[PDB]
A = this chain, B = another copy of it.
């Protein structure tokens, strides 16, 4: 579609606060729902928790130095709500705010643009005790927190993201109960999805009120659905899975409505107050898109809440997570999102892969991660060359970290972390990404 003079492209890396910071009970930080969830036997593999993680709260200068060495222009990170406002609403924690000031200022000194995500799943436990995302007030608590962060940091930080992956917070956290807070109820999942999206919209309006030059987006993960079957019911299964994973969150933001076919199949009411859909669909400067894999499904009349099930397709390449590797789906997803939702521009805020890494002679050679990265960058640029306005790519992740219910066993870093010593070791994929940033 013709690269032209003046066009820009941003290369970054991505992390999140609970997954890397540690210092969970230091620096005035209050507990999050993941501190609580991680204390429940069976919730997280190996009984892992984020108490220490990568100790980035103390080691951030080293990690910023690794970012400068990589040559990224941008760093996508999240602010830990319970580190800066431990009670959820009310008093700012000065020690927590000072940490993010030092992080931001350190990034800027090194030429790196920080990209803050306000909510990456670490809801303060003080707010969960009041109902969390099931409580409509949580959307307003989130918007007030967002306003305070923009008041503190938007003199420097101009590109904001409100929430990350509401699919995970709503459905995995409140319907399937495999993420914090561990609730298993469809109606609660529906309420949570609405208040996450309403929070997004209210926070967007609050940030824009701080200053009109600020840019705001949302990060959505999309899981394209296919079926191996040919029956009419298996084609319906694809539509249902696409509606559950993708359109449930994208349609409110970009079309100001929930997908009617899924609303009907649930048979429950979304707690929409007058004015809510206008707030949720407030115009955005960009979409942050997360992509890792496609899902294969088939019809299943017995399944709940919707009559389809996951299938493990045979004879396909898979990562250490068991996730199918299929880069062509990334190209097609990007084209589809641009056509159906027409975001002004798209940033890939997460893409990456996990494999079993081995340290040999103090080094980590990870050719399968390199291969996934190469093929997904190629697929992203194929979409850009067709005219999709992809303005940057952020690798998940800079460093190995706490992979939620999988714990530390699943390593997404381009830089290895030895958790016994906290040593950082760049992998082969780090050298590859460094080259791609420079030579593209």
- The verdict on A438 contacting B111 (CB below 8 Å), with A2-B5, A3-B2, A360-B155 known, is yes
Closest to A365 in B: B155
Q: Which residues of B contact A377 (CB under 8 A)?
A: 6
Q: How far is the CA of A5 from the CA of B363 in the complex (A)?
A: 32
Q: How does the 8 Å CB contact mask read for A420-440 relative to B, with 1 for contact and 0 for none?
A: 000000001001001110111
Q: Which of A27-35, A52-60, A232-240, A378-386 forms contacts with chain B? A: A378-386
CB-CB contacts below 8 Å: A72-125 with B: 73, 108, 111, 113
For residue A273, CB closer than 8 A to chain B, the reply is no
Tally of chain A residues near chain B (CB < 8 A): 43
Please name 16 further chain A to chain B contacts, defined as beta carbons within 8 Å, in addition to the given A6-B382, A8-B440, sorted by A numbering. Answer: A2-B2, A2-B3, A6-B384, A6-B385, A8-B439, A10-B439, A73-B438, A73-B439, A113-B431, A113-B435, A155-B365, A155-B428, A156-B363, A156-B365, A156-B428, A211-B367
Q: Which residues of B contact A367 (CB under 8 A)?
A: 211, 213
Interface of A is mostly: mixed
Is there an interface contact between B155 and A439, defined as CB atoms closer than 8 Å?
no
Name 20 A/B residue pairs within 8 A (Cβ), A-sorted: A2-B4, A2-B5, A4-B381, A5-B9, A5-B381, A6-B377, A6-B380, A6-B382, A6-B385, A6-B440, A8-B440, A69-B111, A71-B111, A111-B438, A113-B435, A155-B361, A155-B365, A156-B428, A158-B428, A211-B367
Q: Which residues of B contact A113 (CB under 8 A)?
A: 431, 435
Residue from B5, B8, B361, B438 within 8 A of A384 (CB atoms): B5
For residue A269, CB closer than 8 A to chain B, the reply is no
Q: What are the 7 closest A-B residue pairs judged by CB atoms, nearest first?
A: A6-B381, A8-B439, A155-B365, A5-B381, A5-B384, A213-B367, A2-B4
Is there an interface contact between B7 and A440, defined as CB atoms closer than 8 Å?
yes
Q: Which residues of B contact A211 (CB under 8 A)?
A: 367
A211, A361, A434 — which one has the most chain B CB atoms within 10 A of its CB? A434
For residue A61, CB closer than 8 A to chain B, the reply is no
Closest to A211 in B: B367
